[PDB]
Design a protein around this ligand. Structure first.
Ligand SMILES: *[C@H](O)[C@H](CCS(C)(=O)=O)NC(=O)[C@H](CC1CC1)NC(=O)c1cc2c(OC)cccc2[nH]1
Ligand SMILES: *[C@H](O)[C@H](CCS(C)(=O)=O)NC(=O)[C@H](CC1CC1)NC(=O)c1cc2c(OC)cccc2[nH]1
Lengths: 301, 301
């Protein structure tokens, strides 16, 4: 038993991280086959960052202006293009460590592992959730741009995130592997606002099921409720409304524990209104919403 | 900025995990050079597990009684021996992905990354701290025995843990890579008790410094205290006594934030006596003790 925040094994992603330098700007890049993907703002000076015309700036850059390093081996750049906010550098060598991979755009509330790297060298790995306002609460220092988030299904790596910037509130922003930002953000040096964040209700319910499977107990009551009456409280505590589809995706856990979804909703309502009164759930004094139902099923079984 | 619980990149350790089967029992093994290290209880049936004489059981096992798989490649076992609670199987092939490695026995309060594997395939990675009672609060299911915990300095992997059992309280126990258990535990199928767990004070102080670095400052008071007066309060709330050496280890953080160790001890005293009054520190309602000072320095700088 046991339930901890868990990331995917990062070896398959470690095999693809490289270092990209343009002028004096150095960040990380993803090396897949004979292409290296990185943030386009690698081509910018401190002064271009205020209001950059990335098309004009990229036109002033030639292949030899990009220095790409994998370990002790430089990769000669033979082509370059721009897809949205992402720069694609075609190099002369195909990465022999290229795994079976996909480019996927995740929904808000879903989770993925982040491999924080600096100068192309992996530094750490940790689990993250896409907040409803399309930000993530990660750990990034200057030079971490190009680090990627991913999931792994058997032997296939679904890349879903590339880090670009940090917002004034301390949360982080980035794009998919096709250059499209998650949320209303742009890669300019301006203070940008994220929307109001809300709690992922289905994730809190999945986490409560995980707690029940692992022996945590005291919060379960012999009460029940309806979707309408539970939503009435969810609105009061800044929780997302609960839909019947969300009830359906909690089906496997509800069948494993033998506890109806609406019963767990009643328990959650009681926890929201009264608190915990000194107790913890899975060693936590707060209700966690960073675990999807699939994460719970994968970890506990 | 930001501060999440972070694990080391697991690729170097992924390159060493193999599957070891002895009879009907299958678990994980660590393949370094031409040796495979695993838990010895792999040679036990469900019947011997109650009170096994591992010498007698090992005597009745030959080299061919051990099946070792690295991926889809069979590793022919040419020798076998027992060192404490660890089984060493010498095979005919040396692991080409063997990293520079060390075997370390860690102190209570130090942290490391766990690579949970099943049937030789890595499943997840997460960060753990060795509790003062020599247990870890991890996530393990049946078949995870042989999974390892490690640290990485530059390019050297220091292995420090191998999982063996789960206690009745839900915590987990194991050995170092030389077979010696952490704590008073034995590898047999009995309900065993651990000592009283205490909070790692130096880790809580390092976590408070990390909070100050990332913007959280509300808990900083205009007060100071002596190590003796602080230990008086720490003894009441089940905190480990702070030593001058611990104060020295907190030196880099104290210099970076410009906040004396004793002033932060006063802040911790006030937090322990008054609570948090609804506020949070780094998005946490509890004082966290699973981050060493070096973890804080490495993550924030
Ligand atoms: C790339 O390595 C870098 C990562 C920063 S972090 C702290 O998240 O590791 N990215 C940036 O520095 C980006 C570059 C621009 C193209 C997106 N900028 C910011 O992260 C940034 C800019 C601001 C401003 O600008 C006015 C104001 C507040 C916060 C802020 N962050
Ligand atoms: C090995 O894969 C296995 C891991 C169990 S777990 C839940 O931690 O993933 N290890 C065991 O099953 C060990 C085997 C013996 C040699 C150490 N046993 C236990 O973990 C165990 C046995 C008990 C008993 O036995 C009466 C009672 C309570 C708890 C308990 N744990």
């Amino acid at each position: 038993s046991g339930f901890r925040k868990m990331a995917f094994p990062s070896g398959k992603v470690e095999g693809c991280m490289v270092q990209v330098t343009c002028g004096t700007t150095t960040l990380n890049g993803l090396w897949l086959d004979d292409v290296v993907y990185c943030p386009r703002h690698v081509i910018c000076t401190s002064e271009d960052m205020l209001n950059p015309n990335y098309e004009d700036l990229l036109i002033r850059k030639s292949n030899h202006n990009f220095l790409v390093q994998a370990g002790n081996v430089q990769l000669r750049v033979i082509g370059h293009s721009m897809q949205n906010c992402v720069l694609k550098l075609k190099v002369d060598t195909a990465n022999p460590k290229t795994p079976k991979y996909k480019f996927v755009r995740i929904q808000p509330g879903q989770t993925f592992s982040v491999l924080a790297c600096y100068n192309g060298s992996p530094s750490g790995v940790y689990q993250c959730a896409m907040r409803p306002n399309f930000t993530i609460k990660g750990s990034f220092l200057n030079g971490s741009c190009g680090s990627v988030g991913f999931n792994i299904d058997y032997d296939c790596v679904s890349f879903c995130y590339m880090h670009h910037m940090e917002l004034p509130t301390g949360v982080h922003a980035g794009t998919d592997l096709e250059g499209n930002f998650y949320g209303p953000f742009v890669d300019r040096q301006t203070a940008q606002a994220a929307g109001t964040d809300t709690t992922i209700t289905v994730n809190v319910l999945a986490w409560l099921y995980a707690a029940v499977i692992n022996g945590d107990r005291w919060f379960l009551n012999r009460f029940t409720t309806t979707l309408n009456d539970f939503n009435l409280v969810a609105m009061k505590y800044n929780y997302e409304p609960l839909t019947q589809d969300h009830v359906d995706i909690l089906g496997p856990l509800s069948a494993q524990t033998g506890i109806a979804v609406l019963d767990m909703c009643a328990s959650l309502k009681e926890l929201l209104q009264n608190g915990m009164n000194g107790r913890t759930i899975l060693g936590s004094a707060l209700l966690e919403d960073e675990f999807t139902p699939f994460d719970v099923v994968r970890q506990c079984s």
